[PDB]
Amino acid sequence: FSTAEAAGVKVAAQDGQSPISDLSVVLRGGSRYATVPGVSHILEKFAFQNTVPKSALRFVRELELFGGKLYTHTTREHIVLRTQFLKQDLPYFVDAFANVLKETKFQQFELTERVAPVAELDLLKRESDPAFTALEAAHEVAFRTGLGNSVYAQGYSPVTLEDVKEFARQVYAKQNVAVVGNNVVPADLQQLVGTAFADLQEGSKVTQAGTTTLHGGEARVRTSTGNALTIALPIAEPKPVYHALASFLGGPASMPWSVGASPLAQATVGTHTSVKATYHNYGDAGLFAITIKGDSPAEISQVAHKAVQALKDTGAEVTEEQAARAYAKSKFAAAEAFENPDSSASVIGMELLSGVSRIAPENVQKFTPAELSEAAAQLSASAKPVVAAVGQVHALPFADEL
Amino acid sequence: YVKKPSYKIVPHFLGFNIPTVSKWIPIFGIWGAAAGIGALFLIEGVPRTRQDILSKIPIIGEHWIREIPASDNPF
């Protein structure tokens, strides 16, 4: 991806040999920058509604004539709006993004009838998985605000049209916008962005209200719809070794009808439970999480004990084989993330907006068994463990039990 | 490179357009034949229908040319 600048907008593109292009506008407008809970979700859902030049209806009917597709999502850091189309249709898609950023009519009826109901279905679908809920609850305990804000709009905190219009006034500005083109000729994109996004406000960099603070604790979400448990550890100094540690501890199986050879996968034997270790870098803080879902609260409890033990055992000793396995699993995870257009866009988006130079999968560091064990030791001995239980919470573990 | 999709709006009225209606023109034709045959069949007994239409059909038309002998007719 050749980084350049076109009329004050950061543009990154990589030409390829395929008939299909992906253009993604990445906005510094994710939930950590939210002003009101849920506004970044609502603003994401308000993309490609009625603009002054082109109605939502006209946009969708024309998009079907190009056979293009539209994908949007919100993270803690970004709102990502992606279009996928045939290479030659690039100018239409650039102009469409320009209309959205410059000329969206944020109309109250769209909020009530279109945007908010879709936002609500989005959340209900995500929450059907209790592991999603547990990991969201864990971020809320660990960070409280900023990274602890909810990503998604909820019913209890109603977002108003004035809320969304204010946030959009900040976010939809040259300082918060990056354009990322996969299989787009870089010279052609710079020319088009330079004509289309010229009259966009300059605005100012959106900032997190307040510094990231770390906290420990417990969240207990009573659902009747399945059981999960996250064990998170907030990280004050995000380091790349936690990727290797997450991949080492593992949890999911690497082949069908098997359990897996990872320490966390081996913790599930004899139970209908699954486990996944994850590491989330957010620049200034991070979160190392182990999520366990299952239908039996008794089994989840059982696995949770083994999970904590596994992390302590890692802090003691890792073999050379295991450290190499972690390098392999981690390089692979990095490679597939840079391939998937969803995550790809946000990776370069973070390089363009924030300035965090991307780590190419081929340049993923190999951590010695010493470095891995030291990282695990630093986690087992954390002052601020977070535990989020979801489901039959009376039967799930507590932080002090773990 | 393509800047705009290529299309026009065809004239329409009450949700009908010429491409659609033109597909149904033959069907109206057959329905009209059905209605014609049915109507004619319904009035086949009317003497005027026989005199003016049915008796004039070649070959077949003699089916409707029938005379009561004067000896058998009170009127």
From Swiss-Prot, chain A:
Primary location: mitochondrion
Swiss-Prot/TrEMBL keywords: Electron transport, Membrane, Mitochondrion, Mitochondrion inner membrane, Respiratory chain, Transit peptide, Transport
In its keyword annotation, does this UniProt entry include Transit peptide? yes
One Pfam annotation, family name? Peptidase_M16_C
Q: Does the keyword Transcription regulation apply?
A: no
Report one GO cellular component. mitochondrion
* Mode of membrane association: Peripheral membrane protein
- GO aspect biological process, one term: proteolysis
One GO molecular function term of this record is: ubiquinol-cytochrome-c reductase activity
Q: What start and end residues bound the annotated signal peptide?
A: none
> What compartments host this protein?
Mitochondrion inner membrane
Into which family does the record put it?
Belongs to the peptidase M16 family. UQCRC2/QCR2 subfamily.
Q: What does this protein do?
A: Component of the ubiquinol-cytochrome c oxidoreductase, a multisubunit transmembrane complex that is part of the mitochondrial electron transport chain which drives oxidative phosphorylation.
The record describes its quaternary structure and partners as: Component of the ubiquinol-cytochrome c oxidoreductase (cytochrome b-c1 complex, complex III, CIII), a multisubunit enzyme composed of 3 respiratory subunits cytochrome b, cytochrome c1 and Rieske protein, 2 core protein subunits, and additional low-molecular weight protein subunits. The complex exists as an obligatory dimer and forms supercomplexes (SCs) in the inner mitochondrial membrane with cytochrome c oxidase (complex IV, CIV).
Which PANTHER family has this protein been placed in? CYTOCHROME B-C1 COMPLEX SUBUNIT 2, MITOCHONDRIAL (PTHR11851:SF209), METALLOPROTEASE (PTHR11851)
Q: What is this protein called?
A: Cytochrome b-c1 complex subunit 2, mitochondrial
Originating species: Yarrowia lipolytica (strain CLIB 122 / E 150)
